Amino acid sequence: QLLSQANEAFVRNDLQVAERLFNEVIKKDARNFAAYETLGDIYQLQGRLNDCCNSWFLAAHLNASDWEFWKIVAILSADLDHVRQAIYCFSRVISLNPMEWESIYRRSMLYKKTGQLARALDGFQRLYMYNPYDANILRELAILYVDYDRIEDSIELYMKVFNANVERREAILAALEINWKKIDAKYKCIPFDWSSLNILAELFLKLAVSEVDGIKTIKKCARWIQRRESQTFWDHVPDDSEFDNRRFKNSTFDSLLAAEKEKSYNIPIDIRVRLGLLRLNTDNLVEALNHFQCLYDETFSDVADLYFEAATALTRAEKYKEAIDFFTPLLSLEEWRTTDVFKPLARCYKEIESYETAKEFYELAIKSEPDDLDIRVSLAEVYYRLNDPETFKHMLVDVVEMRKHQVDETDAERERIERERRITAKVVDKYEKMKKFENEAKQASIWINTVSELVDIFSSVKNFFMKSRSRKFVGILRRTKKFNTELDFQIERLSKLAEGDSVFEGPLMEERVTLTSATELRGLSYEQWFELFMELSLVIAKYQSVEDGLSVVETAQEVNVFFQDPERVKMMKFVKLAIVLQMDDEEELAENLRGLLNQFQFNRKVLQVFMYSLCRGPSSLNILSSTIQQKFFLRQLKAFDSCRYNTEVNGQASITNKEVYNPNKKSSPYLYYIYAVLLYSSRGFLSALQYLTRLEEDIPDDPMVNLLMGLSHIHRAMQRLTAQRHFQIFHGLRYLYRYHKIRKSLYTDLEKQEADYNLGRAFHLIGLVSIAIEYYNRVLENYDDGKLKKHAAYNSIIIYQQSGNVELADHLMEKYLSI
Amino acid sequence: IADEFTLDLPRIPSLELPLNVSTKHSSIQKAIKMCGGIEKVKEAFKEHGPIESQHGLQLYLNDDTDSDGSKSYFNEHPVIGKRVPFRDESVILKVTMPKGTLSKNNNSVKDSIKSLKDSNKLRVTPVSIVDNTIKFREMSDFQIKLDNVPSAREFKSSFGSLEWNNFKSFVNSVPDNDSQPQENIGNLILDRSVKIPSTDFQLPPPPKLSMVTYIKNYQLFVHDLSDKTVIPSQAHEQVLYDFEVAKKTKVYPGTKSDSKFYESLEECLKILRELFARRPIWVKRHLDGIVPKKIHHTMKIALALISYRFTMGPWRNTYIKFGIDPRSSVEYAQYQTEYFKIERKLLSSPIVKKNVPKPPPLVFESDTPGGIDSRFKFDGKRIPWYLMLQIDLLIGEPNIAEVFHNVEYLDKANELTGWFKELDLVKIRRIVKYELGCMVQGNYEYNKYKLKYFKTMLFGAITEEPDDAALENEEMDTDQNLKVPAXXXXXXXXXXXXXXXXXXXXXX
Amino acid sequence: VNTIYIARHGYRSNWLPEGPYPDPLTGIDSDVPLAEHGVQQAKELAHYLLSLDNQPEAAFASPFYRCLETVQPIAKLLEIPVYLERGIGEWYRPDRKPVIPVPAGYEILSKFFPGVISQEWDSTLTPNEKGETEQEMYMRFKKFWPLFIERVEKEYPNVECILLVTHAASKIALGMSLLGYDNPRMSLNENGDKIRSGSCSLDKYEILKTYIPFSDRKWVLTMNGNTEFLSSGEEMNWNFDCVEVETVYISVDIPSGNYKERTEIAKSAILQYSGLETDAPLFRIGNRLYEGSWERLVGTELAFPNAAHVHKKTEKIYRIKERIVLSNVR
């Protein structure tokens, strides 16, 4: 071609003015990248960048192996906000080499800008896998898992950094016997500092289900920093004694070196406040404040976004007194003086019965957004709580007309005796209509309705609660379903608040009224009301949601007539326990049991409620196996010995019952038994025998003592590593063979079946499997009750799978474990 | 080779039951009901972390409700099934065939496909992938029947049924102050229908019961420190018989003549007789530093015909010469026992496991010739090797001395706190808890104001339970068997025990 | 563009037994909306796609009102654009008695579907307003693919997977034309197995293993009308000839012979089976080849497809009693 002569005659460039002739060669040949490169190159010199990237894009497809050229035109395109054209150019690079880690970063960052994050995330796992030790890849990879709500996988991304930072420091301190080049080649990691701990705190809040286990992880990362990883004992104290001035009052911190005390015990406030938000979702107000009271020492303007994020949490958690302390300082600043401070602040002053102070903060919020009526209806409510109905009616016409404009486009003494008269007739007849009558699940819902229509008359009196009723509890009373919307409900409610009265939920929304008598509020008499709360709590727990009945009893514990009187606070502690059994959560059951055992000391009915409540499951094993319970009953078990043995003046400071009567000074076989279960459940088979053997001296013909004794030896034997192991299993079987001889002989023919199973189950434990099936074939063949047969066929099947006798494991499963 | 199918599919969980669930939708929902319900099956797949940071499902094989709403057999001790880690992903295929082909072909898919080999109606398509499974590899636990226990009948009908009509009768029945904790609970119950035996005591079960060349010794033990109890003053009927013949024929029946057990015994026996004359109360762990290695095996037999040991009281687990009742004189007050424990579970640090010195050997040589070491003794430094230690050893510490040298002794021995008041003993115990907790951390400085408040008191890291090093040495002392050197029938014959083999034969 | 999904609109209202009470909201003839059951289908197609890996990245619906209702929740859930494409409208024979309807544009449908629809995409081709016979239909779908993809691969070079929400007659011609058959009413391979075009079905066309122009590419069908995500199965299938059965599940395990390391599937794999009749079937899974052995399991294995791992940019249980254990032969 002659153009091969003409073009490089024009590549004598030297002033870049012959570009018109290059424009001809790309028209004549239209295949030489040399023409498009230079025509694009000279555009870079004149500065016509949008014309440069075009020519290099046409040029790239002609010689598509030079992955250095796709990149230099790709990055140019991203600079000129042509992202879709850039992602292609990067994608051509990665096909030519999948081991270029700058383009995967620049490409994946553009996927985010485009909205197809799934291809971005795929780029970062590999970019993180082949370079785990760069923070920028870590920081952007953890944003994307958060965009998928994969937060638990983002925490294990920052935590596997921490677990590498730890093993580095342990190797440094051990390798002092220095070679930086030898530890860096083996232990290389991203530095963990206060910043990465700050992000890590944000994730536990967004996760919002592992509150207490996440606090302990923040504190381990806070004591590792500051060089205090050796103070492991803070992992076991409950409530944030470290990082506060309460650490001086600890038995162990007072014992440390004189040099370990001066290390730093101060968190930056951006992390401390997050801990208070963890404790608040845990429903631990006290430690939340102890974190937020540290927010007052910092300079005001530097933490104003934390005054708000703390108060906003306390306001959403119904803590209306504590939140005002954190909103009101912000009013010193003008940039915070808008509705998002006022409207959460004004309802706080409303629930605290400071109405004349809240009248302003509503009247200020409307000036910013008059088009809102959440404020107008509440600010109308305040004019009724104040004795000024004249302005109240003029605010009702303003709001309802304001709503009708929006849906189209889409005698003070005589006032209440006349109400008390008709409300007492309503509550007494509705109660008599509830007694003469009552499927057993539709008779409940019709019953719960005509009782929730009574409990709304008692709880709405406001002389009984030092706080407002929970939204969780009014939600159980708003379940009558006649409402349309939570704000519409107020309007059809407030419209009748004017002068008249009629049937509607929330009678007058609340009101303090003169009680004028004890033993009567309405025609009911304070022992007909308490029987409703307790009977309403259980029925809702049995047929309806269990978590709703628990709100009825937690609300009955704060009525100022019930907990003031004993013999009512007793029942609410039991009724609340009966429901907590059905929550299936560990760490409030224990809070209820320890609440009973402190009141009811040495009582035998409660110690059985303790262990019948804990009769199955790992949620119950973790309670008994806990050290907190092992310290408690030991404290009650030394107190029992003090009551019987001391001839001294000291029988106080733990003794709550002064009525114990034991002239022969016998022990209690229950406290020895409950306490041995804790040590058995803690794999403490030596300590348990120290207490169970004291029972075998006292109650030898009790089966459950001879069973635990037989298992405490069998289990202890398999710990030992000497020839006394064999003598200790034979010493266990003798207590199992008399367990057998007892249940077989002295009980009926259902416990006679138990004893065969638990013996066969013992020979499986010690591996004498050929004997185990012999006892299992007795519970299947020689007895009629079939509830233990499917536990025996379960364990026989396992024997046969291991022995390959699947021919017979199919026969048992089809007969007993069928369904 | 054939038609294609994509495998970018839902990655779903599975649940490999050990049960023969049928195809019916009533049969499946019952098997979900056993495992807690469909809402609790799903949160078992959505849980991460190592074991017991995740607890799996609870297969209740006998899940059914009585008429009162209570769980029939409310103590079932379920089978726990946990997520298998590192599962090999498996595809599942929807095999589709005409209605009625399973019934005529043994209800098997292996053969059904073989019957209609060339039909156009067989459609076989993958529908999902299984990346996660729960399966039940563990085994069922020991089971207890509480149907005729009347307290469980009262619990089950109140806390299980949540019926308020009989809940109220329960709570009004618990006495706010119980006057007889020491007695059986058959008196507080008002059912009286089932007639529990009088010696059952209604002890409820725990939540997890499954948690995975010789001589017989005859030492005496004293089980109760009542004002009535008798103390041994003569050894034992059998040991004296085994030992009196050992004097004439020098074999000590139960041994070979070549073991020299008896010649080792006398050379140990004359040692102890000198010691108990010098110090009548002892711990065996102090005697290990005195008797040589060659005659230590026979010491556990010489103590039996020289000494007894209480199983409780102030003189708990010490060997005491015969005829010596420590409640008879106050001079046996400095020998009474005190225990201490270091909680590794709370002090889980490297600072601790170097400062706590390692235990003794089974037998050693005493740095103090012919006596207790300075390493069992507590003197404000050097945590002793063995933390059960008598009052006679603490007094080397100055602050515990001037407490000890100002005590007022009781006129009559208390069954706990001994001759000492409760005050003057916690005054001793709390100092030692403070000093050990400090020297574990390596402090050794001892602030004087806290250490002075105790001495003038009038009225946790370290704890006073018996240490595991002690309990492991108590069992080796209470074991009635010792070494002398310095398949239903086969298993029944292999044991050959005097009791274990007796009852084992009766039950077969 | 390496991957394509195609899906049918859903359950119309006129298919109700009580009859067609609703009116076309747009005013065009036969532009009928969906029933409430057809809306529950389209949500179930969203939660299914949302459980996949190669989720679609753009949606090309037909202008008819019911195809927009189908893709509306798919757009909200996956957060993708929705473009109108008139070239995938219905096939109307010229003998329609009342009228041959032409559907609405953007300005009418944006009022009912605010924000969802994106108006960047002008239609590449318009069906004949007079109506078109069957031979004219299929050549129209021969023209559609080269012109459509080439306008996707230059206005959106980054999009590699797409969804098309269309009708039955189109859905079966879009498939055959893509796979390269001569007329649409023939069977795929030889066995009378047409494309299953049930209500709210889902097809899948992956490219058969530098970048090359469209017409030189080779595609394969890898789903052929999945309706398992539906709570009611395929309702109203249609094929060009229109102008008892039981299901059981079996697992296919792939066990490793190593300590605590798990096999995996690449989320883009392909499966072929053969010898399923006999005792030793052979499966290919991706590039690797296996040989199986039937093994019933004691007990059962219950799988929960409603418990699937949804990704999401912020009732039915499978009773298994038999199993196949695969071993490496490659």
Author numbering:
A (entry chain A): 130 to 306, 341 to 573, 612 to 639, 645 to 1025
B (entry chain B): 25 to 236, 263 to 509, 566 to 592, 1006 to 1027
C (entry chain C): 3 to 211, 227 to 260, 290 to 360, 418 to 433
List passages from the publication reporting this PDB structure.
RNA polymerase III (Pol III) transcribes a number of abundant, short, folded RNAs in the eukaryotic cell, including tRNAs, 5 S rRNA, spliceosomal U6 RNA, and the signal recognition particle 7SL RNA. In yeast, transcription of all Pol III genes minimally requires two conserved transcription factors (TFs) to initiate transcription in vivo, namely TFIIIC and TFIIIB. cerevisiae TFIIIC consists of six subunits with a combined molecular weight of 520 kDa, and binds to promoter elements termed A-box and B-box that are downstream of the transcription start site (TSS). τA binds the A-box with low affinity and is responsible for TFIIIB recruitment.
We report a 3.1 Å cryo-electron microscopy (cryo-EM) structure of τA, which constitutes the most conserved part of TFIIIC. We collected cryo-EM data of a sample containing τA, TFIIIB, and a DNA fragment comprising the A-box and the TFIIIB-binding promoter elements of the His_tH(GUG)E2 gene. However, TFIIIB and DNA had dissociated from τA during sample preparation and are not visible in the EM density. The cryo-EM map allowed us to build an atomic model of τA with excellent refinement statistics, but also revealed density for two molecules of the detergent CHAPSO, which was added before plunge-freezing to prevent adsorption to the air–water interface, bound to τA. The convex surface of the N-terminal τ131 TPR array binds the τ55 HPD and the triple β-barrel formed by the τ55–τ95 dimerization domains. Despite only being present in hemiascomycetes and being absent in other eukaryotes, the τ55 HPD is well-ordered and an integral part of the τA structure, rather than being flexibly attached to the τA core. Our structure shows that the τ55 active site is accessible in τA, arguing that TFIIIC can directly modify substrates and the activity might be coupled to its function as a TF. The acidic plug contains a helix that is rich in negatively charged residues and is embedded in the positively charged DBD.
